[PDB]
Write a protein that binds this ligand. Sequence first.
Ligand SMILES: [Mg+2]
Lengths: 85, 156, 120, 140, 91, 82, 148
Amino acid sequence: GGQWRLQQGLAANPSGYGPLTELPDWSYADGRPAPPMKGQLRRKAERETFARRVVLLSQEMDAGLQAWQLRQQKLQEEQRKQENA
Amino acid sequence: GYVPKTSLSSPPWPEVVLPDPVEETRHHAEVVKKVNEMIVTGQYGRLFAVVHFASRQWKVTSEDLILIGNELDLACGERIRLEKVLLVGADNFTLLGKPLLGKDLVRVEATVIEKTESWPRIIMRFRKRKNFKKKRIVTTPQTVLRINSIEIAPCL
Amino acid sequence: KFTRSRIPEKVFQASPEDHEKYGGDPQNPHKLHIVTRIKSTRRRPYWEKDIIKMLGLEKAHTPQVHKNIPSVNAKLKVVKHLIRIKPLKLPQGLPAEENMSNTCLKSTGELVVQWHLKPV
Amino acid sequence: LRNRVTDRYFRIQEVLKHARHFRGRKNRCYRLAVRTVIRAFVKCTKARYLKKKNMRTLWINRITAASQEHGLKYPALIGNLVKCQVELNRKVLADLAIYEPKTFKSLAALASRRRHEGFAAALGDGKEPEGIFSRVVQYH
Amino acid sequence: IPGRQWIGKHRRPRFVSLRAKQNMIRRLEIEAENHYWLSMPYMTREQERGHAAVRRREAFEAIKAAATSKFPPHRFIADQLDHLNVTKKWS
Amino acid sequence: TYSPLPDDYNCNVELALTSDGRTIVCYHPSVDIPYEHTKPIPREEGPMIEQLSKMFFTTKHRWYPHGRYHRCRKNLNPPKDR
Amino acid sequence: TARGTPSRFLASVLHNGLGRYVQQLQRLSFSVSRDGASSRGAREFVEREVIDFARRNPGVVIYVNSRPCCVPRVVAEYLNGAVREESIHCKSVEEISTLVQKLADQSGLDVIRIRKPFHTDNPSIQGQWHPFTNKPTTFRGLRPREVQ
Ligand SMILES: [Mg+2]
């Protein structure tokens, strides 16, 4: 029943992100938390490099627009400053 | 918009009338109060938990065994609290959470007994008339867990 | 001869019925695409297999962020039958280096930069 | 012969120990035993997929039967247990269907209750108060 | 059927069930939403020009530099002398 | 007066949510059999295989024997469980 | 395969986890040649690691024999009489630490196929299914087409 889960903002597969697969599976009985799961470590590396790509692409987009705008202002000033002599 | 009662007039299923939500939430207050009384007074016998341990969902009593298919970097004999329990039942009540239960509500304990390997497991590939024949032999690691206790906590 | 196919520009000009159907804005559009390969590139031509390699969509059902620029969109117009395109919406801001690891992209299309595992 | 093979008995016995339960001369003669032992190993690896498949269809048969005991069918039971965020899988529900049938009856009443909240929900369209078991738990 | 069911002049017929219609329809709907989101670029083609030329240049400097740094590995005395312990004894 | 299942045969199912709305408390006591729903306690190879087949309602084939090869492949000490 | 190999059910020795955990490995028996390249990493295991291993679990008694062997062996003997003899022939020190720790961690059960991945001995708590669960009784216990 994954189309319902897409309607609810959940993962389409219940083994995807969420509380069944991202909490730790077990703890010590003393209360010590376990060392982290291998798939949770790999998965948080995937989410971290994904977020790094989102930031990197967003910064290239903003720097690209601002560089275009500075090129257009320099073209307008090379239009205006030659209107004399 | 009236239709005379023919066969295809009204649907073949009976019309169910769902209860009013105020009285039904009061009924849930009564039932949760009673089941909390059975947990406080200790009326329950032995429990079972459905716990979503790593690979799948294991139905679990106390005093039983689970064979997992990985090494868990633990010593043989160390106690484990299994979190991600997601159903807890007794003879006369259950407790199923959405999707998991509260850690302050159910405490499932289990020791590691033995960290074995599996029986040797043959992986042969063979395509006819192409001289394609590969044999591999694989033993996965395994740990066995003795679920020591399913303790339940009167927190509803 | 089955050749490469061109697509005219009226195909990629949205209508206000489409702007009301899908929740887009023509003024102030979105920056980042989420692209997801959902149709195998086998039984497809080699140029489509190449574009799917160029977009990093070699695994199926794995989202990939791209730019909403006409060059990237030209490659996406080549393989638009093989993918799924959604806008990357960002409810909270784009994550800083403090919130860099504690993110999760949801199935709706939003990148939630504070990702607890707790219910509301 | 300068160096001819001495250790050859053990290669024959490497293959033939897997043939010890076959019929015919497949348990005895090496030429026949290599083909049937290779073939038994190929079936042994291709049957892991069929083990998983046949267990799952066996569980859907057991959940189907025990849900027909409570008047429901299988797709109403599974779809409406999904819609309650009770994400028990097929193995557990077959094991409750066998060993703990009060719990399976209460899951059947929860799933049919949610099914009727879906019927009354999609019946009275527009804004209406939601069902009680129809609420979802939002995680963040 | 005349021969080999599915290729030839006289092929057997195959018909489009409701499964196949609903599958093709939902593929067309996903396709039409792809047609919506490709209709609104964040930049024009003039504005995108050269916005990532530096990062692409440094990326190919990394690939070029990984190509031109390929050479035999270092050879140590401790490996060759370390072979001599194959006749390590007790006493 | 609403019942999601006809709570008449196995257990009296009473569904509940907690007030925080996260767990589904189900309460189900066992239904006793009523005393009025009870009755008081009352106080040659061919022919033999037709008689056993007619007796246990199975076909004739599982009564004819099987040879030494199938009597001596049978695991005579199988693993017990539980 | 699984039909040529025997199988068994997943068990323990004397309910090995319930009350207390008992180390199931009684004796290790190393036989290590003094002069010989086969038992080199065995010798380096005795010089380095068998003492710290012998202290990390004192319920195991260890017999290093040091005879002129031509292939070194380790012989793990378990509490239930099982004896698993494995060879440490031409294996490095780390591989013998993982091998000996593997023999220490497991038990004297066979390494044949295990049928079920679990073992309850009380599988049913609400009462097992029989065909008269989920069937309502009728008045006077009557069956169909019965008049009186
Ligand atoms: Mg033909």
